[PDB]
Amino acid sequence: ELVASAKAAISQASDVAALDNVRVEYLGKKGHLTLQMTTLRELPPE
Numbered sequence: 001e002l003v004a005s006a007k008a009a010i011s012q013a014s015d016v017a018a019l020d021n022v023r024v025e026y027l028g029k030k031g032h033l034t035l036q037m038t039t040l041r042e043l044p045p046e
Contacts, residue, residue, distance in 0.1 A: 006032055
């Protein structure tokens with residue numbers, strides 16, 4: 001969940017990539033994984 005649901009919408013979007021628009025999914029997905037890494041300000045510090 002989420003950890004793999006975001007990667008499921010990432011690799012599937014990079015499957016039907018006609019031209020070299022792999023860089024465009026590189027933008028939104030690595031932006032999602034750079035933004036959903038901001039949730040590391042919670043959780044136990046252990």
